[PDB]
Amino acid sequence: VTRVLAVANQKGGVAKTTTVASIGAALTEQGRRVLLVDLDPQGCLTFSLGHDPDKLPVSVHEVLLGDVEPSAALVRTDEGMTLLPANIDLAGAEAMLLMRAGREYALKRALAKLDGDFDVVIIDCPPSLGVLTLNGLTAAHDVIVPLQCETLAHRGVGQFLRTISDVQQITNPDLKLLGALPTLYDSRTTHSRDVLLDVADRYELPVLAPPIPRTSVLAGRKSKGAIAYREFADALLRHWKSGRKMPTFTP
Ligand SMILES: Nc1ncnc2c1ncn2[C@@H]1O[C@H](COP(=O)(O)OP(=O)(O)NP(=O)(O)O)[C@@H](O)[C@H]1O
Ligand SMILES: [Mg+2]
């Protein structure tokens, strides 16, 4: 059974892409066959895994449009994950998708052609709530929200949760919000903890554990950040294998 995880948050700079790549690497180390999907036209994930987006002959853009088969667009990574990459062409997608029926289901249709080739698909959503993020949420079974806890600024969480609810009502009833993954956690004071407690208090959003400390990127070594990503990846594995609920930062 292929697990599809979307990593989404319309707020920019909260470590979505670092989280996709680092969870992907951790799961690959544990033996899972991993596909990463870059849905950001700026191509941060693609660049971070060693592919110049501007030089890709095709990308996920042609795949979403149905003009190129998904397998033909896949590229390799040094750590063994497979990548469905993106480049700036993808910014034109919604102009072309809006003119077509079922624009929300383009990525879902593409992944259906790859089912059984991968144990886990992780989708890197751009900092927006438009057609590309909707495609990510519509194709996924689970979603996590990387949530920065350097500052108290979280006015966008409400609209993000509304977006999840809308997707569950219209395009993907089975989507499960696993919760928020704390990122950019600062160990110098209790401020980051207090930020996370504030979010857990005010929003119907599980805050998951462990936080990823502040040290796009790919944390795969013996650092505290890599250690935390591997611990979180283990939690995902247990949840998918035994139904174990994801551990929470605060109950
Ligand atoms: N644990 C970390 N410690 C320090 N810097 C980090 C960490 N995680 C991410 N960063 C940096 O924070 C910045 C934003 O990370 P990134 O993974 O690109 O977030 P993002 O949510 O994908 N940005 P965007 O797609 O534009 O919304 C990058 O410069 C990363 O290298
Ligand atoms: Mg990103």
Among 108, 52, 61, 54, residue whose Cα is nearest residue 84:
61
Name all residues whose Cβ lies below 6 A of ligand 1: 12-18, 40, 44, 126-127, 212, 214-217, 225
How far, in Å, CA of 215 to CA of 223, rounded? 8
Domains located in the chain, CATH noted: 1-251 (3.40.50.300)
* Cβ atoms within 10 Å, residue 151: 11
Q: Which residues of 58-80 are buried (b: 16+ CB within 10 A; e: fewer)?
A: ebbbbbbbeebebeebbeebebe
Distance 242 CA to ligand 2 centre (A): 30
Q: How many CB atoms lie under 10 A from the CB of residue 243?
A: 7
Listed by the residue before each break, gaps in the chain with C–N over 2.5 Å are 215
- This entry's atomic model was obtained through X-ray
Residues in contact with 28: Cβ distance below 8 Å, sequence separation at least 6, in sequence order: 34, 79, 80, 81
**Cα separation of 197 and 179, whole Å?**
14
Q: At what angle do helices 16-29 and 224-242 cross, to 10 degrees?
A: 70
Its sign, for the CA torsion 171, 156, 141, 110, is positive
- DSSP assignment of 20-37 equals HHHHHHHHHHTT--EEEE
Give yes or no for a contact between 85 and 75, defined as CB atoms under 8 angstroms apart.
yes
Q: Cβ neighbours of residue 51 under 8 Å, at least 6 residues apart?
A: 75, 83, 85
From 17, 128, 229, the mutation candidate for ligand 1 (largest count of ligand atoms within 8 A of CB) is 17
Residue nearest to atom 14 of ligand 1 (CA): 13
Resolution of this entry, Å: 1.8
Instruction: Strand 142-148: give its sheet, edge to edge.
Output: 75-76, 82-84, 34-38, 120-124, 3-7, 142-148, 176-183
CA distance 102 to 121: 22
Structure tokens at 56: 């890709």
- Phi/psi-derived region of residue 208, left when phi > 0, alpha when psi is between -120 and 50, beta in every other case: beta
